[PDB]
């Protein structure tokens, strides 16, 4: 066990209190703030119609891509009704996984559509735009439980 | 509360010295003797600090050292039931509005509006004070 390289300490309770040097930031996400906001808006209210938690995983997903997609979907707060779209550009791979509750609501029929929407934009060269488009298409496909 | 009392004791000492020296050097070396405005103000700010410091000293002598006032105190020592702190309440804004009505009534010399504002201030202060004591309706 080790805390962050500098300035982060485990508190009396579980929470770890961290710090950053004044100049720099915390999130460090390599995407524009505005299209990050756009993808957040998608995930948030373009999925309210689906009533199933939509999640995006840009990180790498190696070895058996499908299985790693399953066990990263496991981390979604309620995987029962969840739709995790994982893209690894280190492998140029896309994998969409669904929860048991989100099944038969058009999710299975929307999987190729969402994957194609992601793939087109990715080959165009826009990771965040492709993720947004895939989320939009999949959320349109899914119906409320 | 030793340091809390000592702060006001020091302030009282300084203000008493200031009032005394002002009174003396104004009774003599001034155009018209004692100024009677600065002198009284200094005397009664000495009184302000004296009252507050005397109460704080009484409390300090009546109280055993608290974790707050105790160096080398652990958080668990003070951990416990903190008292009641009022949650959300909309009575303060009504009190402010009632006092503003009374104030505008005083500014624009409108005795009717002054009376209305004072009645509203009484009502709003009653509401604020009774907020957490009003019992359930008895039907």
């Amino acid at each position: 066990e080790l805390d962050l390289p500098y300035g982060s300490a485990l508190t009396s309770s579980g929470r770890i209190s961290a710090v950053t040097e004044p100049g720099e930031l915390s999130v460090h996400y390599p995407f524009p703030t505005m299209d990050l906001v756009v993808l957040d808006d998608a995930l948030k209210y373009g999925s309210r119609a689906a009533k199933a938690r939509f999640a995006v995983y840009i990180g790498p997903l190696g070895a058996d891509t499908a299985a790693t997609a399953r066990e990263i979907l496991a981390n979604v707060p309620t995987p029962e009704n969840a739709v995790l779209l994982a893209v690894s550009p280190d492998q140029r791979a896309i994998e969409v996984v669904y929860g048991a509750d989100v099944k038969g609501r058009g999710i299975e029929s929307a999987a190729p559509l969402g994957v194609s929407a992601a793939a087109a934009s990715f080959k165009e060269g826009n990771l965040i735009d492709g993720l947004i488009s895939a989320v939009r298409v999949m959320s349109a496909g899914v119906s409320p439980a | 509360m030793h340091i809390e009392a000592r702060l006001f004791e020091i302030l009282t000492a300084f203000f008493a010295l200031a009032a005394v020296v002002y009174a003396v050097l104004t009774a003599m070396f001034a155009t018209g003797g004692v100024e009677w405005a600065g002198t009284t103000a200094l005397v009664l700010t000495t009184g302000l600090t004296l009252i507050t410091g005397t109460f704080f000293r009484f409390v300090a002598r009546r109280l055993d050292t608290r974790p707050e006032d105790y160096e080398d105190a652990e958080i668990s020592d003070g951990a416990g039931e903190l008292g009641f702190f009022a949650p959300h309440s909309w009575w303060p804004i009504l009190i402010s509005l009632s006092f503003s009505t009374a104030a505008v009534g005083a500014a624009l010399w409108l005795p009717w509006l002054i009376a209305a504002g004072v009645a509203f201030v009484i009502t709003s202060v009653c509401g604020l004070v009774f907020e957490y004591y009003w019992g359930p309706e008895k039907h």
Partner: protein, 312 residues
Amino acid sequence: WSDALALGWPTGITPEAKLNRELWIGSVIASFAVGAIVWGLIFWTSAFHRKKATDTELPRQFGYNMPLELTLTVIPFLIISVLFYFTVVVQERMMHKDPNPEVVIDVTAFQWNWKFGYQKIAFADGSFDYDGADPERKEAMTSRPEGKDEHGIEKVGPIRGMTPEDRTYLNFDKIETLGTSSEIPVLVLPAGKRIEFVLNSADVIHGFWVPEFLFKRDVLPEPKANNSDNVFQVSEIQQTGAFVGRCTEMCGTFHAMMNFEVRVVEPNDFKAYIDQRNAGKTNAEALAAINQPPLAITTEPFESRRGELVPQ
């Protein structure tokens, strides 16, 4: 260099003004030295950037330097004590209160203009058998035998038995150089003599300030009852000519329109002016007769119009 370093302080025209200007120069020199050293400290500690060579090692983290704190809390006391001693010695010549003024000017300042009385003149060389009038100082004692009630009240008056509408504190004189809204008053004073000013306000507080006297006073309504030493003296006025004077306390709306002049003329010019004013004449007529511009040359009685965009 002195003029520039004075930060726009006019070169005084009185011994008191000169001494005050010298004190101001000294105090500004001290203040600029202190400011220079402190700004040097700030711009030199701004050289303590977070050098990239600074590895995972925080600064000296010292704080709490008792000897340095003692030194830097002793020296400011020395500096301010020296400044206070200089201030006191200069202050001593703020109102010497010489009991033998060479000319006494009754400066009564009413709402939005001035009036100068020439209460008394007594030249040291021997001249000016002149004096103030004071028949017109009439009180307003509201000591009626009975008021609204039938008997008993016999009210004397609110304040010290008199009424606020008293005006007895005001003093009046034979030669009054009243300033009209369209005619800037020009108090003419003899050069080289000691000029006392007895200061009063007809209605409200305001402030008599001749910028080239390097001194101002606040003409209050009832200074004697307010424990205010309104009367103040000037030992001498060396330079002649017209010097602007201004109102330097809130008077009302036309607080910026109270400008006056203090025209210092030679003693013979003052002789002629006072004689010609004793003779029925106005201030402008007397100035023209002594061959000096009648109207205030340093300022004008600018437009009574509320402003530029008003349609006349």
